[PDB]
Amino acid sequence: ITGRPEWIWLALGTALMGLGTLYFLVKGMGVSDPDAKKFYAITTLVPAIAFTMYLSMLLGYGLTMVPFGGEQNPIYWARYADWLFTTPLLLLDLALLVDADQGTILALVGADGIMIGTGLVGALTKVYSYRFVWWAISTAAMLYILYVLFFGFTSKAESMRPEVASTFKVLRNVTVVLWSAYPVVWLIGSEGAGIVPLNIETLLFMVLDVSAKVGFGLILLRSRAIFGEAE
Amino acid sequence: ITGRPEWIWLALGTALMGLGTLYFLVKGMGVSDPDAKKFYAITTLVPAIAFTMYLSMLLGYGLTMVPFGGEQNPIYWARYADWLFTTPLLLLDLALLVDADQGTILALVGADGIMIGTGLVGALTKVYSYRFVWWAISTAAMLYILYVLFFGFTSKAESMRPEVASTFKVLRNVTVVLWSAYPVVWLIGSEGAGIVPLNIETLLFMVLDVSAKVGFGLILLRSRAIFGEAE
Amino acid sequence: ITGRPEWIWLALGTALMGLGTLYFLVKGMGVSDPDAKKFYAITTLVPAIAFTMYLSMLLGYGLTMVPFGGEQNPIYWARYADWLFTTPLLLLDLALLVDADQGTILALVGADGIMIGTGLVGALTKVYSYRFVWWAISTAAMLYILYVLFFGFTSKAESMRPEVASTFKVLRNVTVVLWSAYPVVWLIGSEGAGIVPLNIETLLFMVLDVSAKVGFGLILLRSRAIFGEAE
Ligand SMILES: CC(C)CCC[C@@H](C)CCC[C@@H](C)CCC[C@@H](C)CCOC[C@@H](CO)OCC[C@H](C)CCC[C@H](C)CCC[C@H](C)CCCC(C)C
Ligand SMILES: CC(C)CCC[C@@H](C)CCC[C@@H](C)CCC[C@@H](C)CCOC[C@@H](CO)OCC[C@H](C)CCC[C@H](C)CCC[C@H](C)CCCC(C)C
Ligand SMILES: CC(C)CCC[C@@H](C)CCC[C@@H](C)CCC[C@@H](C)CCOC[C@@H](CO)OCC[C@H](C)CCC[C@H](C)CCC[C@H](C)CCCC(C)C
Ligand SMILES: *C/C=C(C)/C=C/C=C(C)/C=C/C1=C(C)CCCC1(C)C
Ligand SMILES: *C/C=C(C)/C=C/C=C(C)/C=C/C1=C(C)CCCC1(C)C
Ligand SMILES: *C/C=C(C)/C=C/C=C(C)/C=C/C1=C(C)CCCC1(C)C
Ligand SMILES: CCCCCCCCCCCCCCC
Ligand SMILES: CCCCCCCCCCCCCC
Ligand SMILES: CCCCCCCCCCCCCC
Ligand SMILES: CCCCCCCCCCCCCC
Ligand SMILES: CCCCCCCCCCCCC
Ligand SMILES: CCCCCCCCCCCCC
Ligand SMILES: CCCCCCCCCCCCC
Ligand SMILES: CCCCCCCCCCC
Ligand SMILES: CCCCCCCCCCC
Ligand SMILES: CCCCCCCCCCC
Ligand SMILES: CCCCCCCCCCC
Ligand SMILES: CCCCCCCCCCC
Ligand SMILES: CCCCCCCCCCC
Ligand SMILES: CCCCCCCCCC
Ligand SMILES: CCCCCCCCCC
Ligand SMILES: CCCCCCCCCC
Ligand SMILES: CCCCCCCCC
Ligand SMILES: CCCCCCCCC
Ligand SMILES: CCCCCCCCC
Ligand SMILES: CCCCCCCC
Ligand SMILES: CCCCCCCC
Ligand SMILES: CCCCCCCC
Ligand SMILES: CCCCCCCC
Ligand SMILES: CCCCCCCC
Ligand SMILES: CCCCCCCC
Ligand SMILES: CCCCCCCC
Ligand SMILES: CCCCCCCC
Ligand SMILES: CCCCCCCC
Ligand SMILES: CCCCCCC
Numbered sequence: 001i002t003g004r005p006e007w008i009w010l011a012l013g014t015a016l017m018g019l020g021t022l023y024f025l026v027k028g029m030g031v032s033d034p035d036a037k038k039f040y041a042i043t044t045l046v047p048a049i050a051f052t053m054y055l056s057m058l059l060g061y062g063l064t065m066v067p068f069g070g071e072q073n074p075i076y077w078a079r080y081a082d083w084l085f086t087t088p089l090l091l092l093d094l095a096l097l098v099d100a101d102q103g104t105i106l107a108l109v110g111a112d113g114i115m116i117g118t119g120l121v122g123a124l125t126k127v128y129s130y131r132f133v134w135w136a137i138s139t140a141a142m143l144y145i146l147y148v149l150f151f152g153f154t155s156k157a158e159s160m161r162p163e164v165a166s167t168f169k170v171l172r173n174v175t176v177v178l179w180s181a182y183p184v185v186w187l188i189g190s191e192g193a194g195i196v197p198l199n200i201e202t203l204l205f206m207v208l209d210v211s212a213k214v215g216f217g218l219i220l221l222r223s224r225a226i227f228g229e230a231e
Numbered sequence: 232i233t234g235r236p237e238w239i240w241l242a243l244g245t246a247l248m249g250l251g252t253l254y255f256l257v258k259g260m261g262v263s264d265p266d267a268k269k270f271y272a273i274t275t276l277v278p279a280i281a282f283t284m285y286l287s288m289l290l291g292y293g294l295t296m297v298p299f300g301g302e303q304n305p306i307y308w309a310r311y312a313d314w315l316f317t318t319p320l321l322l323l324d325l326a327l328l329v330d331a332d333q334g335t336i337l338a339l340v341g342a343d344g345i346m347i348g349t350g351l352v353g354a355l356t357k358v359y360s361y362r363f364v365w366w367a368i369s370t371a372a373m374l375y376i377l378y379v380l381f382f383g384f385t386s387k388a389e390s391m392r393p394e395v396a397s398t399f400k401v402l403r404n405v406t407v408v409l410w411s412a413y414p415v416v417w418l419i420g421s422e423g424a425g426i427v428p429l430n431i432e433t434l435l436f437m438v439l440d441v442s443a444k445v446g447f448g449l450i451l452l453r454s455r456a457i458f459g460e461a462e
Numbered sequence: 463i464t465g466r467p468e469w470i471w472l473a474l475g476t477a478l479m480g481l482g483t484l485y486f487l488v489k490g491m492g493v494s495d496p497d498a499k500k501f502y503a504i505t506t507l508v509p510a511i512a513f514t515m516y517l518s519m520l521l522g523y524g525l526t527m528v529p530f531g532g533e534q535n536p537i538y539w540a541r542y543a544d545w546l547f548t549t550p551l552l553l554l555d556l557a558l559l560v561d562a563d564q565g566t567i568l569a570l571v572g573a574d575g576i577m578i579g580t581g582l583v584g585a586l587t588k589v590y591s592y593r594f595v596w597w598a599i600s601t602a603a604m605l606y607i608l609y610v611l612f613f614g615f616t617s618k619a620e621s622m623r624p625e626v627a628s629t630f631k632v633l634r635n636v637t638v639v640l641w642s643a644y645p646v647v648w649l650i651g652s653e654g655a656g657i658v659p660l661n662i663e664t665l666l667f668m669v670l671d672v673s674a675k676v677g678f679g680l681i682l683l684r685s686r687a688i689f690g691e692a693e
Pocket of ligand 23: 174211212214215216218219222
C-alpha cells in the first residue's frame, strides 16, 4: 500500500468520505419529511460510493496499467466507477431542488453518462493521440451539462421559493467551478499530457472530490430548501 | 460441464428458475390491473435474470479463476451480475407493497448496490485478508437494508390495508432470514474461509436463490395485496 | 484504422450518428413543452450514444478477439454497450407515446436488457455451439418485446389521440421490421454461422442502426404527437 507515493491522499480521501458518509447518515436520522428524505438519501449515497472506490484505490484493486507512450501507465479506473454513479446523483440533487422537468433530468443524466463513459474510454485508450479525442468529446458533454445548469435551471429557480433559489445558486456555482477543474487535471496529469505527477494529481482529485461531495452536501443538507414548505 | 461436481446444482438451479419464470409469465397473462402488472413485471423478471445467470454458470461462462492463498480459486462471478439486478427488484416489490417514499426506495436500492458491488470486489480481490474487509462493508450495507425493512417499513405497513400489511410482514420475514444466510455462506465457502467446499456452497446458494426468488414470488403473486382495491 | 475493410462503414456510421445527433439537438432548442422535451431528450441521446460507440469501433477500442472454431474472431463488443442503453431508450419513446403503464414499461425494459445481455454473452462465448443457445434465449426475449408492442400497445394507442395512434403505428412497424433483422444478421454473420463476411455484416448493421435511430427519430420528432394537446 505504502509503496505508492499517492497512498497518503487515497487514505485521506477514504477517511474523509467515510466520515462524511457517517455524518450525513446520523444527521438524516431525525428526518420524516418526504422531500428531505430524498435529498438525504441522494446526498448520503454520494460519499458512501466514493468511500468504497477510494478504498478500492487505496488497496490497489481500482488500479490498472495501461500501455501508452511506450510505458506502463498507472490508471486508477475506480474513479470512473465512482463518478458514473455519483455525478448523476449530484445532478439529481440540483435537478430536484429546482423541480426540473423529466426531459431535462434525462438530458442531464444522459449527458453525464456520456461524459464519464467517454472519460473512461479515454483513460483506457492505448493510442496516445486518441486519448485526447475522447477527452474532447467528454468535455463537450460537460459543457452541455454546464449550459443546462445555467440556461435551463437558473431561470427556473427564480420562479421558485427564495430559499431554493438561493441554495441552488450557491450549489450551481460550486458545481460549475469544481467540475470544470476535473478535465484540466486529467489533461495535465497522468491520464493525459503527464506534466503533473500522479501523486500530485491524486491530491488534486481528492481535494476536488471531497469538496464536490462532502462540501456540496454540507451546504445542501444545512439548507431549509430541502424541506417542503410546512407549518 | 459435468467435470465440475457442482454442475448438478447449477443445472437444477437453472431448471427451477426457468420453470419459475414460465409459471409467473403464464400466471400474469390474465392481469389487467395496473398495480398487479407492476408486481408481475418485477417478480417475473427476477427468476428470468437468475435463469440466464445460472445458465451462464452451468455452461462455464460465469466462472473465473482468482489467485489467492497461493491457489487458483474458482469464483462464480455471474452470481453478482444476477444479484446486482435481482436484489433491487426484490426490494422494489417490498417497497411498492408498502408505498414507500421515493427517498427510502433510493436509500434501499443504493445500499443494495453497494452491498452487491462490494461483495463483487471482495470476490475478485487477490489479497486474501482484504476480501474480508469488503465482506464487512457489504455486510454493513446489508444490515442497513435490514434495519430499514424493519424500522422504516413495518410501521408504514400497519397504516395500510390489512392484506398488504400481512403479506408484507410474511415477505419481510422471509427476506430477512434468507438474505442473512448469504454472507454466512460466502464467509465459510470458497470465496472466504474455504471451510465448506464449492459443491456444497453451490447447493446452499441454489436453495437460497430459489427460495428467495421463486418462493418469495409464489407468496407475493398469490396475494390479494398486489391488486388495487376495486369493486 | 484503414487496415480493417469494414472501417468505411464504421466511419460512415460515426458520421451519420454524429450528424443525426447535432440535427436533433439543434431542432430541440426551440422546445419548451414538457412532453416534447422528454421525447427530444430520449431521441437525441440515442444517436449520441451510438456516435460514441461507432467511434470506439472505428478507432479499434470497441473490438476484441474471441477464440472459437479454432480461429481468432473479431467481435465488436461495443455494439452491445450501445444497444444496452439505446434500445431501452427507443422502447421508452414508444411506451411514452402511448402512455404505457409502469408495469409494462418495466417488462419491456427488463426483457430488452435480457435480450442485449444474452446477446453479449453469446457474442463472447468460446464454445461455438453454446453461442446459439444464447442467440435463442435473446431472440425469445425479442419476441416477447415484439408481442407486447403489438398485443399490449396497439390497442392502447387506439384509445388515445389520433396523432399519437398514427405515429405510434408507423414507429411500431418500423421498429418491428428493423429490429427483427438484427438476430438474422448476427446469426449469419461473424458472430454466428460466418456465412456473411464482417465487412458486409458491418454495412448491414450500419444501415439498420441509422434507420432504427436517426430514421426513427426523424419520424418521431416531426410528429405533433410528441406535444401535449395545447391551445
Ligand atoms: C443513459 C446514459 C447512461 C448513457 C451512457 C453513455 C455511455 C453509452 C457512454 C459510453 C459507455 C461505454 C464506453 C462503457 C464502456 C465500458 C468499458 C470501458 C469497460 C471496460 O472494457 C474495455 C476493454 C478493456 O479496455 O475490455 C476488453 C474487452 C472486453 C471483452 C469487454 C466486453 C464487455 C463490455 C464492456 C460489455 C459492455 C457493457 C456496458 C458497457 C456496461 C456499461 C459500463 C459503464 C462504464 C457505462
Ligand atoms: C446507486 C447504486 C447503483 C450505487 C452502486 C454502488 C457501487 C458504487 C458499488 C461499487 C461498484 C463497483 C465496485 C463495480 C466494480 C465492477 C468491477 C468489479 C468489474 C470488474 O473489473 C475489475 C477488474 C478485475 O478484477 O478489472 C480489471 C481492470 C479493468 C481495466 C476494469 C476497467 C473497467 C471498469 C470496471 C469500469 C467501471 C464501470 C462500472 C464499475 C460499471 C458498474 C458494474 C457493476 C458491478 C456495478
Ligand atoms: C432489469 C434489466 C437491466 C436486467 C438486465 C438483464 C441482464 C441480467 C442480462 C445479463 C447481463 C449479463 C450477462 C452481463 C454480463 C457482462 C459481461 C459480459 C461483461 C464481460 O465479462 C465477461 C468475461 C469475459 O468474457 O469477463 C471475464 C471475467 C471477469 C472477472 C468478469 C467479472 C466482472 C463482472 C462482469 C461483473 C458483473 C457486472 C454486471 C454484469 C454489469 C452489467 C453489464 C451489462 C452488460 C448488463
Ligand atoms: C464526485 C466526483 C465528481 C463531481 C467528478 C466529476 C468529474 C468530471 C466533471 C469529469 C470530467 C472529465 C472530462 C470533462 C473530460 C476528461 C475526463 C473527465 C472524466 C475527468
Ligand atoms: C436472489 C438472490 C439474492 C436474494 C441474493 C442476496 C444476496 C445477498 C444478501 C448477499 C450478501 C453478501 C454480503 C452481505 C457480504 C458477503 C457477500 C454477499 C454479496 C454474499
Ligand atoms: C439502435 C440499435 C438497435 C435498435 C439494435 C437492436 C438490436 C437487436 C434487436 C438485437 C437482437 C439480437 C437478438 C434478438 C439475438 C441475437 C443477438 C442480437 C443482440 C443481435
Ligand atoms: C485546475 C488546477 C490545475 C493547476 C495544477 C497546478 C499544480 C501545480 C503543482 C506543481 C506541478 C508539479 C510539477 C513539478 C513536479
Ligand atoms: C449509467 C448509470 C446511470 C444511473 C445513475 C444512477 C442515478 C440515476 C438517477 C435517475 C434520475 C431519474 C430520471 C427520471
Ligand atoms: C446498479 C443497478 C441498479 C438498478 C437496478 C434495477 C432496479 C432499479 C429499481 C428502481 C427503483 C425506482 C427508484 C425510484
Ligand atoms: C441495463 C441498462 C438499463 C437502463 C437503460 C436506461 C433506460 C431506462 C429507462 C427507464 C424507463 C423508466 C421505467 C419506469
Ligand atoms: C458554455 C456554457 C457556459 C457555462 C459553462 C462554463 C464553461 C467553463 C469552461 C470549463 C473549461 C473546461 C476545460
Ligand atoms: C440491525 C437491524 C436489525 C434487523 C437485522 C437483523 C440482523 C441479522 C444479522 C445477520 C447476520 C449477518 C452475518
Ligand atoms: C410473436 C409476436 C408477433 C409479432 C412479432 C413478429 C415476429 C417476427 C419474427 C422475427 C424473426 C426473428 C428471427
Ligand atoms: C499526440 C497529441 C495529438 C493531438 C490530438 C489532439 C486532439 C484533440 C481533439 C480536439 C478537437
Ligand atoms: C455539444 C455541445 C453543446 C453545448 C452548446 C449547447 C447547444 C444548445 C443546446 C440547447 C439545449
Ligand atoms: C487473513 C484474515 C485476516 C483478518 C481480516 C478480518 C477483517 C474483517 C474486518 C471486520 C472489521
Ligand atoms: C452502517 C450501518 C448502519 C446500520 C445502523 C442504522 C443507522 C441508523 C440509520 C437510520 C436511517
Ligand atoms: C454447432 C451448432 C450446434 C447447434 C446448436 C443450435 C442451438 C440452437 C438452440 C435453439 C433451441
Ligand atoms: C418467452 C417468449 C414469450 C412470447 C409469447 C408471449 C407469452 C405471453 C405473454 C403475455 C404477457
Ligand atoms: C472512520 C474512519 C475511517 C477511516 C478508514 C480509512 C482510513 C485509512 C486508514 C489507513
Ligand atoms: C423448461 C426446462 C428448462 C431446463 C433447462 C435447463 C436445465 C439444464 C438441463 C441440463
Ligand atoms: C460532423 C462530422 C462528424 C464526422 C466525424 C466522424 C467521421 C469519421 C471521419 C474519419
Ligand atoms: C466548496 C467548499 C465547500 C465548503 C463547505 C463548508 C460547509 C459549511 C456549511
Ligand atoms: C421460503 C419458502 C417459500 C415457500 C413458498 C411456498 C409458496 C406456496 C404458496
Ligand atoms: C426506416 C426509414 C426511415 C425513413 C426516415 C425518413 C424521415 C423523413 C421524415
Ligand atoms: C460522525 C458522527 C456525527 C455525530 C453527530 C453529529 C451531530 C448530528
Ligand atoms: C454566490 C455563491 C458563491 C459561491 C462560490 C463558491 C466558489 C467555490
Ligand atoms: C465559471 C468559472 C469556472 C472556473 C473554472 C476554474 C477551473 C479550474
Ligand atoms: C409452467 C406452465 C404453467 C401452466 C399454467 C399454470 C396455471 C396458471
Ligand atoms: C409470520 C411470518 C412467518 C414467516 C417465516 C418464514 C421463515 C422462512
Ligand atoms: C431474524 C432471524 C435471522 C436469522 C438468520 C439466519 C441466518 C442463517
Ligand atoms: C446540423 C445542423 C442543423 C441546422 C439547422 C436545421 C434546421 C433546424
Ligand atoms: C403504415 C406504416 C408503414 C410503415 C412501414 C415501414 C417499413 C420500413
Ligand atoms: C412483421 C414483418 C417482419 C419482417 C422481418 C424482416 C426481417 C429481415
Ligand atoms: C473502514 C474500513 C477501512 C479498511 C482500511 C484497511 C486498510
